[PDB]
């Protein structure tokens, strides 16, 4: 906070399958980039990992993230566009939920209709 919609500070948000995979990342980082990170983790249902860095060492962090299968992006999501980022994300998540359900209904309807016919 005080850089939530910031751009002069670089944050790296990212999902990782487990906190175990995250250690291996931490090991690369510490060997190859120094201790320029602050490592925090929150348990999901996945693991929220957070690395926090300069805005000019991004690419080198990115190389580590790609090679151990992490979703650490500079900013997560292509939906960011309201201020906060999250506000846009939350409305786009309401379109996604209702549009999947309609698909499930058309499929279901047709399934009950044609099983016997087939």
């Amino acid at each position: 906070i005080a850089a939530a919609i910031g751009a002069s500070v670089n944050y790296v948000t990212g999902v990782i399958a487990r906190d175990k995979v995250a250690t291996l990342e931490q090991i690369l980082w510490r060997v190859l980039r120094g201790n320029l990170f602050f490592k925090t983790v929150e348990i999901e249902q996945n693991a929220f990992i957070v690395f926090s860095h300069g805005d000019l060492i991004i690419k080198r962090i990115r190389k580590i993230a790609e090679s151990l299968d992490a979703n650490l992006y500079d900013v997560d999501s292509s939906n960011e566009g309201r201020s906060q980022q999250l506000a846009k994300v939350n409305k786009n998540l309401s379109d996604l939920y209702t549009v999947l359900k309609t698909t499930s209904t058309t499929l279901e309807s047709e399934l009950y209709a044609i099983a016997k016919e087939l």
Binding site: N35, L36, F38, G54, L56
Partner: protein, 52 residues
Amino acid sequence: LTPNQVNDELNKMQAFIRKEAEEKAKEIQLKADQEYEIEKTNIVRNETNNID
């Protein structure tokens, strides 16, 4: 981690950031003086030949 580790790693961290800013800032201003001097000479030199 340990309290000792985290403060040692914070004191290292901002020391690099201030240092990166000093080191880049020196190059910019060191080149800005070469640029001043050159550009002042050029502007005269062009024009003094015209007055001539």
